[PDB]
Design a protein around this ligand. Sequence first.
Ligand SMILES: [NH3+]CCC[NH2+]CCCC[NH2+]CCC[NH3+]
Lengths: 84, 143
Amino acid sequence: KPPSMYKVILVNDDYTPMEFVIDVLQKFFSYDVERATQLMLAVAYQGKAICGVFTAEVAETKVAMVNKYARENEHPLLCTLEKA
Amino acid sequence: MLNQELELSLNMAFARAREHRHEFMTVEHLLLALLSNPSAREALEACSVDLVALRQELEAFIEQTTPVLPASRDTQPTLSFQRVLQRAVFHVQSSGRNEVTGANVLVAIFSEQESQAAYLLRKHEVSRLDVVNFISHGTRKDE
Ligand SMILES: [NH3+]CCC[NH2+]CCCC[NH2+]CCC[NH3+]
Protein backbone atom coordinates (compact mmCIF):
# COMPACT_ATOMS: atom_id res chain seq x y z
CA LYS A 1 0.00 0.00 0.00
CA PRO A 2 2.32 2.80 -1.28
CA PRO A 3 1.51 6.36 -0.16
CA SER A 4 -0.90 8.05 -2.54
CA MET A 5 0.11 10.94 -4.84
CA TYR A 6 -1.71 14.28 -4.47
CA LYS A 7 -2.98 17.03 -6.75
CA VAL A 8 -2.09 20.53 -5.58
CA ILE A 9 -4.85 22.95 -6.60
CA LEU A 10 -5.44 26.71 -6.77
CA VAL A 11 -8.97 28.04 -6.38
CA ASN A 12 -10.44 31.15 -7.97
CA ASP A 13 -11.55 34.19 -6.00
CA ASP A 14 -12.47 37.75 -6.94
CA TYR A 15 -9.88 39.64 -4.88
CA THR A 16 -6.50 38.08 -5.77
CA PRO A 17 -4.69 39.80 -8.67
CA MET A 18 -3.84 37.64 -11.69
CA GLU A 19 -0.33 39.01 -11.28
CA PHE A 20 -0.08 37.43 -7.85
CA VAL A 21 -1.27 34.00 -9.06
CA ILE A 22 1.43 34.09 -11.73
CA ASP A 23 3.91 35.01 -9.00
CA VAL A 24 2.83 31.90 -7.07
CA LEU A 25 3.06 29.49 -10.01
CA GLN A 26 6.55 30.77 -10.75
CA LYS A 27 7.90 30.90 -7.20
CA PHE A 28 6.43 27.62 -5.93
CA PHE A 29 5.78 25.50 -8.99
CA SER A 30 8.81 26.43 -11.14
CA TYR A 31 6.71 27.42 -14.12
CA ASP A 32 7.96 29.82 -16.76
CA VAL A 33 5.83 32.88 -17.58
CA GLU A 34 3.91 31.29 -20.47
CA ARG A 35 2.99 28.06 -18.70
CA ALA A 36 2.17 29.99 -15.55
CA THR A 37 -0.08 32.38 -17.44
CA GLN A 38 -2.20 29.65 -19.01
CA LEU A 39 -2.59 27.92 -15.65
CA MET A 40 -3.79 31.12 -13.94
CA LEU A 41 -6.18 31.60 -16.87
CA ALA A 42 -7.54 28.07 -16.43
CA VAL A 43 -8.03 28.86 -12.75
CA ALA A 44 -9.99 32.00 -13.56
CA TYR A 45 -11.94 30.35 -16.38
CA GLN A 46 -12.74 26.95 -14.86
CA GLY A 47 -12.82 28.12 -11.23
CA LYS A 48 -9.82 26.03 -10.20
CA ALA A 49 -6.91 24.16 -11.75
CA ILE A 50 -4.48 21.39 -10.91
CA CYS A 51 -1.06 23.00 -10.61
CA GLY A 52 0.93 19.87 -9.87
CA VAL A 53 1.07 16.27 -8.65
CA PHE A 54 3.39 15.44 -5.76
CA THR A 55 3.89 12.83 -3.05
CA ALA A 56 1.62 13.27 -0.03
CA GLU A 57 4.55 14.55 2.03
CA VAL A 58 5.67 17.18 -0.49
CA ALA A 59 2.10 18.18 -1.31
CA GLU A 60 1.28 18.79 2.32
CA THR A 61 4.26 21.10 2.80
CA LYS A 62 3.74 22.84 -0.52
CA VAL A 63 0.10 23.70 0.25
CA ALA A 64 1.06 25.16 3.65
CA MET A 65 3.77 27.29 2.08
CA VAL A 66 1.65 28.68 -0.72
CA ASN A 67 -1.20 29.65 1.61
CA LYS A 68 1.31 31.27 3.95
CA TYR A 69 2.69 33.41 1.13
CA ALA A 70 -0.79 34.47 0.05
CA ARG A 71 -1.74 35.35 3.61
CA GLU A 72 1.49 37.31 4.14
CA ASN A 73 0.74 39.33 1.01
CA GLU A 74 -2.81 39.94 2.26
CA HIS A 75 -4.50 37.94 -0.54
CA PRO A 76 -7.15 35.22 -0.14
CA LEU A 77 -5.53 32.88 -2.71
CA LEU A 78 -6.65 29.45 -1.45
CA CYS A 79 -4.51 26.43 -2.27
CA THR A 80 -5.71 22.88 -1.53
CA LEU A 81 -4.73 19.26 -2.14
CA GLU A 82 -6.72 16.28 -3.42
CA LYS A 83 -5.75 12.60 -3.49
CA ALA A 84 -5.39 10.34 -6.56
CA MET B 1 19.48 16.37 23.24
CA LEU B 2 20.52 14.47 20.12
CA ASN B 3 23.74 12.55 20.70
CA GLN B 4 26.62 13.68 18.48
CA GLU B 5 26.10 10.72 16.17
CA LEU B 6 22.55 11.85 15.35
CA GLU B 7 23.64 15.45 14.70
CA LEU B 8 26.04 14.13 12.07
CA SER B 9 23.22 12.20 10.40
CA LEU B 10 20.83 15.16 10.54
CA ASN B 11 23.56 17.35 9.07
CA MET B 12 24.31 14.71 6.47
CA ALA B 13 20.72 14.48 5.26
CA PHE B 14 20.47 18.25 5.17
CA ALA B 15 23.63 18.52 3.05
CA ARG B 16 22.43 15.73 0.80
CA ALA B 17 19.37 17.85 0.00
CA ARG B 18 21.21 21.16 -0.47
CA GLU B 19 23.81 19.47 -2.66
CA HIS B 20 21.05 18.63 -5.17
CA ARG B 21 19.30 21.97 -4.63
CA HIS B 22 16.28 20.00 -3.40
CA GLU B 23 13.34 22.18 -2.42
CA PHE B 24 12.76 19.89 0.58
CA MET B 25 14.74 17.74 2.99
CA THR B 26 12.26 14.88 3.44
CA VAL B 27 11.69 11.97 5.78
CA GLU B 28 13.24 9.77 3.08
CA HIS B 29 16.39 11.90 3.17
CA LEU B 30 16.31 11.33 6.91
CA LEU B 31 16.05 7.54 6.66
CA LEU B 32 18.80 7.20 4.04
CA ALA B 33 21.12 9.21 6.29
CA LEU B 34 20.08 6.99 9.21
CA LEU B 35 21.37 3.94 7.33
CA SER B 36 24.86 5.23 8.21
CA ASN B 37 23.81 6.03 11.77
CA PRO B 38 25.23 3.26 14.01
CA SER B 39 22.31 3.29 16.44
CA ALA B 40 19.88 3.17 13.50
CA ARG B 41 21.91 0.78 11.32
CA GLU B 42 22.23 -1.68 14.20
CA ALA B 43 18.46 -1.80 14.81
CA LEU B 44 17.82 -2.39 11.12
CA GLU B 45 20.55 -5.05 10.81
CA ALA B 46 19.02 -6.63 13.92
CA CYS B 47 15.74 -6.68 12.00
CA SER B 48 17.36 -8.42 9.01
CA VAL B 49 16.82 -5.73 6.39
CA ASP B 50 18.62 -5.65 3.05
CA LEU B 51 20.39 -2.31 3.46
CA VAL B 52 21.69 -2.51 -0.09
CA ALA B 53 18.17 -2.48 -1.57
CA LEU B 54 16.62 0.00 0.88
CA ARG B 55 19.35 2.50 0.03
CA GLN B 56 18.67 1.94 -3.67
CA GLU B 57 14.93 2.43 -3.19
CA LEU B 58 15.22 5.59 -1.07
CA GLU B 59 17.80 7.15 -3.38
CA ALA B 60 15.65 6.37 -6.43
CA PHE B 61 12.56 7.76 -4.72
CA ILE B 62 14.23 10.99 -3.64
CA GLU B 63 15.59 11.74 -7.11
CA GLN B 64 12.26 11.20 -8.85
CA THR B 65 9.89 12.86 -6.37
CA THR B 66 11.79 15.72 -4.78
CA PRO B 67 11.25 19.09 -6.58
CA VAL B 68 14.41 20.98 -7.51
CA LEU B 69 14.85 24.69 -6.81
CA PRO B 70 15.02 26.99 -9.87
CA ALA B 71 18.39 28.59 -10.71
CA SER B 72 16.50 31.78 -9.92
CA ARG B 73 14.84 30.37 -0.92
CA ASP B 74 16.92 27.56 0.61
CA THR B 75 16.22 23.86 1.23
CA GLN B 76 13.33 23.34 3.63
CA PRO B 77 12.29 20.47 5.96
CA THR B 78 8.92 18.92 5.15
CA LEU B 79 6.23 19.21 7.85
CA SER B 80 6.51 15.42 8.02
CA PHE B 81 10.21 15.72 8.76
CA GLN B 82 9.56 18.25 11.58
CA ARG B 83 6.98 15.98 13.20
CA VAL B 84 9.31 12.95 13.18
CA LEU B 85 12.12 14.84 14.88
CA GLN B 86 9.78 16.50 17.37
CA ARG B 87 8.20 13.12 18.14
CA ALA B 88 11.61 11.62 18.96
CA VAL B 89 12.60 14.54 21.18
CA PHE B 90 9.31 14.41 23.07
CA HIS B 91 9.34 10.66 23.71
CA VAL B 92 12.93 10.74 25.00
CA GLN B 93 12.03 13.59 27.35
CA SER B 94 8.76 11.97 28.39
CA SER B 95 10.44 8.63 29.04
CA GLY B 96 13.09 10.17 31.25
CA ARG B 97 16.22 9.88 29.08
CA ASN B 98 18.97 12.42 28.34
CA GLU B 99 19.82 11.78 24.69
CA VAL B 100 17.96 11.18 21.46
CA THR B 101 19.53 8.52 19.24
CA GLY B 102 19.13 7.57 15.59
CA ALA B 103 17.19 4.52 16.72
CA ASN B 104 14.70 6.77 18.53
CA VAL B 105 14.28 8.85 15.37
CA LEU B 106 13.94 5.66 13.35
CA VAL B 107 11.13 4.62 15.70
CA ALA B 108 9.35 7.94 15.20
CA ILE B 109 9.34 7.44 11.44
CA PHE B 110 6.66 4.73 11.69
CA SER B 111 4.19 7.43 12.81
CA GLU B 112 4.32 9.19 9.45
CA GLN B 113 1.67 7.01 7.80
CA GLU B 114 1.76 8.57 4.34
CA SER B 115 5.53 8.74 4.14
CA GLN B 116 7.35 6.64 1.57
CA ALA B 117 9.84 5.93 4.35
CA ALA B 118 7.26 4.20 6.57
CA TYR B 119 6.05 2.27 3.52
CA LEU B 120 9.53 1.04 2.53
CA LEU B 121 10.16 -0.13 6.10
CA ARG B 122 6.94 -2.14 6.09
CA LYS B 123 7.88 -3.57 2.67
CA HIS B 124 11.06 -4.98 4.20
CA GLU B 125 8.83 -6.44 6.91
CA VAL B 126 10.04 -4.19 9.75
CA SER B 127 7.32 -2.99 12.11
CA ARG B 128 7.58 -0.39 14.89
CA LEU B 129 7.41 -3.15 17.51
CA ASP B 130 10.38 -4.97 16.00
CA VAL B 131 12.59 -1.91 16.38
CA VAL B 132 11.21 -1.10 19.84
CA ASN B 133 11.85 -4.64 21.12
CA PHE B 134 15.43 -4.57 19.91
CA ILE B 135 16.13 -1.18 21.50
CA SER B 136 14.58 -1.76 24.92
CA HIS B 137 14.96 -5.50 25.47
CA GLY B 138 17.80 -7.76 24.44
CA THR B 139 19.34 -7.84 20.98
CA ARG B 140 15.92 -9.31 20.25
CA LYS B 141 16.76 -10.22 16.66
CA ASP B 142 13.83 -10.70 14.28
CA GLU B 143 15.15 -14.26 14.22
N1 LIG C 1 1.41 10.77 26.65
C1 LIG C 1 2.12 10.64 27.97
C2 LIG C 1 3.47 10.00 27.90
C3 LIG C 1 3.75 9.01 28.99
N2 LIG C 1 5.11 8.40 28.85
C4 LIG C 1 5.41 7.41 29.92
C5 LIG C 1 6.78 6.82 29.73
C6 LIG C 1 7.07 5.83 30.82
C7 LIG C 1 8.15 4.82 30.53
N3 LIG C 1 8.33 3.88 31.66
C8 LIG C 1 7.12 3.01 31.80
C9 LIG C 1 7.12 1.98 32.88
C10 LIG C 1 7.19 0.58 32.41
N4 LIG C 1 6.70 -0.42 33.42
